[PDB]
Structure formats: C-alpha cells, structure tokens
Swiss-Prot record:
Family, as annotated: Belongs to the RRM elav family.
Part of the intact protein present: 49 to 215 of 385
Designated name of the protein: ELAV-like protein 4
Superkingdom of the source species: Eukaryota
Domain spans labelled RRM: 3-81, 89-167
An annotated GO BP: RNA splicing
Organism: Homo sapiens
Gene of this entry: ELAVL4
An example Gene Ontology CC term for this record: dendrite
Amino acid sequence: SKTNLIVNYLPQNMTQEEFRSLFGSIGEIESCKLVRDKITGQSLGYGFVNYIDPKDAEKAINTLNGLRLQTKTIKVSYARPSSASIRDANLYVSGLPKTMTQKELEQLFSQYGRIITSRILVDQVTGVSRGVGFIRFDKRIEAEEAIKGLNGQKPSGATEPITVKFA
RNA sequence: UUUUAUUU
C-alpha cells in the first residue's frame, strides 16, 4: 500500500497515548487513532496510524508486527481503502478435518479471494483442533462466493462436509 | 464465535 496502517489485536489496557507513543517511535505520524465504541468510548481493539513517509509505514510493519503486549500479539499491516465492500466479510467455519492446518484452510479458501485472517480454534486444554475456525476475506463478495462454493462440501480427503456461514 | 471484536 503506502502510508496508512491498521493495527489489530491491541490490548484493552493500551491508551491512545501509548498507542501514538509506540508508533511514533518509528517516525513522524501525520495522524493516528485508537478506534473506540461510539457510545461507550471503550477501545475496540484496533487502531490506525498514518505516517508522513511511506518508508516508516514499512518500518512499522517490519518492526512492530508480532509485538506481544500484555495478553496480545499485535498485528500491523496496511489499511485497505475504507470501503463498505470490505465490511462483513468474516466467516465462521466448522466441520473441518481436525488434522487440517491453518496453511491448508487458507489454501482451501484462497481460491475465492484474498484472505485477511484465518484461524483454527484449538481446545483450551490439550491444544487439539476443534475443527472450527474463521476466515476473513478482503471483500464481502469473496466471502459470499466462498459460502456458495464450500458450504456443505467435502474438502479433498475429508470424510465429512464443512459448514460455512457469515460470522 | 476467535488474540471477543479489520476500516477510523
């Protein structure tokens, strides 16, 4: 992209100043905002940082992505243009082979469009896949095509069919 | 039904 970044998985405790302070260390910022609920005013867990120099936006991703703050591992990536087309493109998937890895889940779903995030939920005990997860596409239309194409289908080698629906 | 919460 260029100069605008979206930072996800920010801890609920991180303030607007600590946010600007953390990213301001990379280089000059034209603007940045820790997004908060319109009514409660509480952090929504993500924010945006727009640098003056695109080289610093690149440095921010290279140096800050994966930084562990409190219980989170933040993600820093390029913010795609604010368009209604990228909204509601999150899918909840279930019935996946428990042997399936995130790499395979994304290869399966990538046929339908650019994947923003993907995750396989694991048992909060032994760490065994639950065969359930999420896939967030770039465009809502791509998620629509993935539902039509994969909902109720059996992914190569799978003995059981998977379920795909909007989160 | 997520590192609850990826477009201010």
